[PDB]
From a paper:
The contractile tail of Agrobacterium tumefaciens bacteriophage Milano is flexible and bent to varying degrees, which sets it apart from other contractile tail-like systems. A contractile sheath and rigid tube assembly is a widespread apparatus used by bacteriophages, tailocins, and the bacterial type VI secretion system to penetrate cell membranes.
We have determined the structure of the distal part of the tail comprising the baseplate with associated receptor-binding proteins (RBPs) and two baseplate-proximal layers of the sheath-tube complex to ~3.2 Å resolution. A similar Fe ion is likely present in the Milano BCS because the cryo-EM map of the Milano baseplate shows a spherical peak of 6.5 standard deviations above the mean between the side chains of His166 and His168 matching the expected location of a Fe ion. The similarity of the Milano BCP organization to that of the pyocin (PA0626) suggests its central role in the function of the baseplate. In addition to the BW4 C-terminal domain mentioned above (residues 346–396), the Milano BCP protein contains an N-terminal Tube domain (residues 1–127) and a middle Helical domain (residues 141–345).
Author numbering:
A (entry chain F1): 100 to 149
B (entry chain h1): 150 to 395
C (entry chain G1): 298 to 395
D (entry chain v1), E (entry chain w1), F (entry chain x1), G (entry chain u1), H (entry chain z1), I (entry chain y1): 3 to 121
The structure:
Amino acid sequence: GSALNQGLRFQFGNQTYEPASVVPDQLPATGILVLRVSAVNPGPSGNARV
Amino acid sequence: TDGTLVTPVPGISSAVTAYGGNFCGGSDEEECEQFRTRYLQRLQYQPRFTVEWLKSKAAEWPCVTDVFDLGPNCCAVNALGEVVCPNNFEFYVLFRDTFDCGLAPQCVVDEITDWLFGSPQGLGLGEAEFGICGKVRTAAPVKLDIILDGLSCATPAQSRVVEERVTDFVNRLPPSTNLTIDQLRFIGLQVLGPSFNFNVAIRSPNDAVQPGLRFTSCGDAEIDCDYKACLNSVVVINNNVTTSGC
Amino acid sequence: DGLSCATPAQSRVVEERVTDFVNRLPPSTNLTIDQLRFIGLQVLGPSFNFNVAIRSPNDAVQPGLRFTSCGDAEIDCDYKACLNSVVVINNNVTTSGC
Amino acid sequence: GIFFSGGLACNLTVNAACGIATTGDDCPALYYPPKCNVQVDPLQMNAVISEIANAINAFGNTYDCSRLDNLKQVLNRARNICDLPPFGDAPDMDDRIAGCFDGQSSTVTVQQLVNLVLG
Amino acid sequence: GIFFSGGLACNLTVNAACGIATTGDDCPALYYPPKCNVQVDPLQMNAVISEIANAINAFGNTYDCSRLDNLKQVLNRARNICDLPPFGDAPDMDDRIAGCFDGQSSTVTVQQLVNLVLG
Amino acid sequence: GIFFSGGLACNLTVNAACGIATTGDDCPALYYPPKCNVQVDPLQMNAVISEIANAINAFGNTYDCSRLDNLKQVLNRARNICDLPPFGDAPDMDDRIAGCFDGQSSTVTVQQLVNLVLG
Amino acid sequence: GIFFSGGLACNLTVNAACGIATTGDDCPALYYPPKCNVQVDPLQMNAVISEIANAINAFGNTYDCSRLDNLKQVLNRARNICDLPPFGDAPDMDDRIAGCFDGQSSTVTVQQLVNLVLG
Amino acid sequence: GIFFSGGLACNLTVNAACGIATTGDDCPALYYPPKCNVQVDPLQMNAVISEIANAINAFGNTYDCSRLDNLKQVLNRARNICDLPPFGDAPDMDDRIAGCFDGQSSTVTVQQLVNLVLG
Amino acid sequence: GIFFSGGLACNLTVNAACGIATTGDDCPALYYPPKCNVQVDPLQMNAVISEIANAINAFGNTYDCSRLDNLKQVLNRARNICDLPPFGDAPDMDDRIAGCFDGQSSTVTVQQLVNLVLG
């Protein structure tokens, strides 16, 4: 039930990632959200194994 | 039920209590297509105008979220075997935001009837016209559990939206209507495609027998009068089956 | 079975959708009852009762036609389901009238 | 059993007879409700036809599908004491005889019979 | 009753028994037609269920749901002379006794049999 | 009539019975299969109605609508030997008397009971 | 387990045998519904295959590829007593011996056997 | 039963046992035809599930879904001797003892063993 | 055989127990993989049907599709000591006797039996 906005940014290792699809308005009732996410900087640096 | 005072005032404790515990009324601006279909419902020729008038009026009670007519499982027949037309005006109400499943106790709907028809009914001491009798009803819940199998192979977006749609469909199901498997499968097929494996199952928690419920051979869930289906939980059995196979 | 009680617009829509679904049915493909029921559930909504049955004309046997235990019209291949006539009927009584 | 699983009581329906003596609340007496959307449960019909089949096989007689008077026939055989098989041995004082005594169908032993006749 | 309200006569359908005796024409015997599809009326099935259940509870027996031979047991209770309870007092000269007489399920009172034994 | 034409055998359904003695082989003990949308055939119900009506009409009784225990009354009339007609003329020595002899219901000749009483 | 997780009970399908004692609710008795669109779950056929394979490998025997009757051999070697290995030791104390004692199959001790032969 | 209803006989497909001894035409031994447009019938699979479940339940054992070797364990308990219950009652003369007799798995009454042990 | 032709090993899937001993590299232990575009192979179901049906016909019994517990009765007859038929002749000095022996279930010859009891 918590609130969500389009300004979600994730920090994986040293890189930053952002939502690709549209983020739902509310966190679903299951309590877990799976999101398609793309890197912020183009190139081979965004690739990682984390 | 509980809240705090934002601005501090000397001599007044910060903890305040919601007298009644509910906050009704909140509604949004009416759109253009909804207004068009409401206006077109005023000019056109309407049989049984009284029933729709009463439903539109009863929808003005605080925290009344939905109004439904008497469901199909709520008809009747005489000894000769012909349908009987009801002489009163009766329907249901759903407070989907305050109580569980939106089903209210009998006292609330009794007060709604007393406000709508009067006491005694039919004398024009209420909103309803003179010589207009009837009664608002409520329903008792029947807890149903829903299990979706074969959904792990879908992308997370598809499984998420299918779960949401099944939940929203079961929550809005009117009182006195069966919860057929075919309806859930078409809430699934309309998303996953016509060649996807998807199986749904409707059960009762702990396999307990519940009043106002009968499992037809089909696997559906027949629900009798004055009862309403209630989503206990939606569970997904992702037995690791995926597209890759690792 | 059970369209007569729906407003004539919905009955006309259901007919012009069923005939068009059965016309364009690929050869050697079952005309299952589920696929027909789900054409009524889309316009009629979940609160309607609406049953669908498939039969052979005059209950005659035809080469390459069988009926499954669930009522599906199973078609042997190099055959194609062609519509003869869609008929509406009402046998289950209801309060739709009054 | 032959009752409907999710039915109603006798006084909430029509053509329903209550006062039926059933063993255990587990399987009470419920009848089909008076609602348009009720179809006869095939399993209940199976129970009914099984009951009439078990009844029709009584007295050793076999059932005939063609003719339909069979239960009348077994009932007639029930009230056909002339069809009761003759006894092979000789009765003693401890045997019983049925008769209408003071208006009620009861039984009496041979000993009371000989006592009354010797008086 | 157990008949169909809007049914046809016995001779117009199949599996129908004619010549059924009824109390006036207000209780006609009608059966389902072989023509236009009809679903068996649940209330008529209620009548049939009530009839069978009342038949079971005769002779002071109770209905059972675990097994399916109750009416068979009741038919065994009928035609079984031995079941009949014994008489408390002594059989008086006026009472009647059963027995097959000239191939007829008749009864004769004690007076005649005492006359025979004395004669 | 009864034993629905397209039915299964005992263990392929629920509530069915077995040992159903049937004349010939073309009258098989069948029962409604327990799957989705199977509907009770009207004609079968016609046959069951015919059987029940013949059973009630037995013993010369008539059927009534306002009574749901007609079969119970007919069964009681099958029992209660006090409903049997009296014997018009005097009985002869070769007649038969019903009774519970050695725990089994049987008939014994008048000659035997007279031989017993004279002893 | 071998039960379809998205399944039903007996009275909701056919060819399902319940009365299956399970070690809790986490392995419930569920079967496939009587529909014409469901597909058999391969991850359950793996459970059935594992069950039968572990059954064949009992008694040290190895599964084989040209014999569709391996379980038959395993059953024969399970019942056939004579293939049981000879006791590679002299008998002693109270090594129980099997038998059909009083009707119920059981075993008796050596001394219990010698008590009767001593007398 | 566990056979496919619309299938072919044994010699018209692959992996089909021939000579299966059924109990009459009613239950014919048919297997899934090769072809391609054929899928495992869920109603058929229910039968195999049920057979294996009953086999596991036999001998008073309960099903466990966390283990895949249940039928193997019930087979081992079938062969194992002192898994059998011990006997408390005294062995009468006419009991049985099983073993090897001319290379056959049979049993012999206690008479023969005592008579041989006399010598 | 009863395995999948193009499946995976035991650890590359679920509900797959390994340690299955097979004779040679041919038709090894392969189970269905966890891909949801894989359906059960009908011929493998024909193989599993063959295995179950051959398991039923052990001991000369016949398989009835009407019942769902045939393998349970087969397993019961397997463990039922009293099932073993009587030995047609008199025993001798070399025959073997069943039973457990210090938890080492085996066979004992009448030789050592008479040697121990004659003491």
